[PDB]
Amino acid sequence: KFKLPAEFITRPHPSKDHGKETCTAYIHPNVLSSLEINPGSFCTVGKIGENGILVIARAGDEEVHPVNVITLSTTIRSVGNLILGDRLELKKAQVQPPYATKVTVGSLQGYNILECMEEKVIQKLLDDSGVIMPGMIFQNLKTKAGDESIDVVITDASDD
Amino acid sequence: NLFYLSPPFIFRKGSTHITFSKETQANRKYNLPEPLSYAAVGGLDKEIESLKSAIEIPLHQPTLFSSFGVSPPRGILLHGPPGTGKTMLLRVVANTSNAHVLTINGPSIVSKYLGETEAALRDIFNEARKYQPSIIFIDEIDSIAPNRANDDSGEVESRVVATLLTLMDGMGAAGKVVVIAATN
Numbered sequence: 505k506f507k508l509p510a511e512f513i514t515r516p517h518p519s520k521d522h523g524k525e526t527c528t529a530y531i532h533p534n535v536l537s538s539l540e541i542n543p544g545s546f547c548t549v550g551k552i553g554e555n556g557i558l559v560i561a562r563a564g565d566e567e568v569h570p571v572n573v574i575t576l577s578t579t580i581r582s583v584g585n586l587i588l589g590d591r592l593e594l595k596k597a598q599v600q601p602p603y604a605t606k607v608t609v610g611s612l613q614g615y616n617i618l619e620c621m622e623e624k625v626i627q628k629l630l631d632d633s634g635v636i637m638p639g640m641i642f643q644n645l646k647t648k649a650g651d652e653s654i655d656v657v658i659t660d661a662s663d664d
Numbered sequence: 665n666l667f668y669l670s671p672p673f674i675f676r677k678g679s680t681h682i683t684f685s686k687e688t689q690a691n692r693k694y695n696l697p698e699p700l701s702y703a704a705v706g707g708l709d710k711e712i713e714s715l716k717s718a719i720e721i722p723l724h725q726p727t728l729f730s731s732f733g734v735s736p737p738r739g740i741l742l743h744g745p746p747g748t749g750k751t752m753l754l755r756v757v758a759n760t761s762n763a764h765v766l767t768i769n770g771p772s773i774v775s776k777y778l779g780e781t782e783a784a785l786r787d788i789f790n791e792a793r794k795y796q797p798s799i800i801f802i803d804e805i806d807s808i809a810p811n812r813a814n815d816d817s818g819e820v821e822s823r824v825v826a827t828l829l830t831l832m833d834g835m836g837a838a839g840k841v842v843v844i845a846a847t848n
């Protein structure tokens with residue numbers, strides 16, 4: 505009888521963050537089966553006693569990933585201030601978040617987002633993200649000049 | 665009549681002789697557990713007002729710290745000379761503030777020995793947060809958490825700290841309690 509660990513260990517996600525893998529924190533498939541969690545499904549990741557954060561369940565390689573380790577794209581770790589070695593509490597979600605109607609997007613240093621980067625690349629990142637809660641970061645974003653790193657934080661999202 | 669706190673009766677309209685009275689309390693012979701009030705503990709006015717502030721800030725206006733962001737004062741230590749009225753003030757806060765009072769911690773706990781008591785305590789602070797704005801009193805905080813003079817300890821002191829570090833969550837979410845200690 506396989507034993508489900510009570511607390512999982514946060515670790516890097518060797519895959520890049522620019523892709524559609526923002527909230528698709530890869531989880532060891534054995535844990536996915538042992539917790540009645542379907543692939544590509546939403547589940548709550550959070551530190552012990554804290555309110556949960558939403559991640560999408562995606563199956564990883566059994567051999568490479570040990571059982572405890574949960575891999576997060578660096579965009580979502582910054583949502584709930586998840587620093588490495590933070591013990592988590594995986595639980596199964598039950599409500600699908602509704603779509604978005606308005607999003608107010610921030611920046612690290614107040615740089616004019618209109619003037620520095622295209623709306624198309626920002627929209628690409630945001631769409632490929634899929635589910636957006638207020639607090640992530642999209643890092644290492646190539647700008648129009650190609651020599652500037654500006655990070656897209658998200659201040660708020662409102663549904664009408 | 666058995667176990668009734670005061671003699672009950674059934675109202676039936678028309679057959680009952682209703683009468684007015686200026687009396688602010690029920691018949692004294694009912695031996696009721698009469699409320700406790702600030703009209704009784706008066707004599708410490710300024711600290712009463714400060715206590716009222718310390719109940720305003722964590723019960724009524726926790727939202728008003730989400731803006732301004734800064735960590736709130738969500739632990740109170742009502743110290744003073746023995747017999748000065750500390751337990752009476754805690755009792756008046758409990759009955760005249762309309763928060764939910766999480767049960768008194770007390771010197772007593774299941775076993776009063778480390779390991780066993782560590783879970784039995786955390787349960788009291790786990791009961792906190794879920795209920796609408798509350799107040800967990802830890803009276804006699806010197807008897808539950810003594811000084812550790814040179815080596816006198818079970819685990820209870822560090823257990824209180826480790827639990828208070830989660831009880832201090834609030835005003836971002838679950839800002840629905842304050843802790844008031846008393847000591848001599």
Ligand SMILES: Nc1ncnc2c1ncn2[C@@H]1O[C@H](COP(=O)(O)OP(=O)(O)OP(O)(O)=S)[C@@H](O)[C@H]1O
Nearest residue numbers: 704705706707745746747748749750751752847848
């Ligand atoms: N207005 C008053 N102010 C202060 N004490 C009063 C007052 N009226 C009556 N007393 C009584 O003074 C006694 C004070 O006892 P406590 O409040 O239990 O003492 P205390 O300050 O809590 O000391 P301990 O050692 O910490 S239990 C109670 O019996 C009160 O009812």
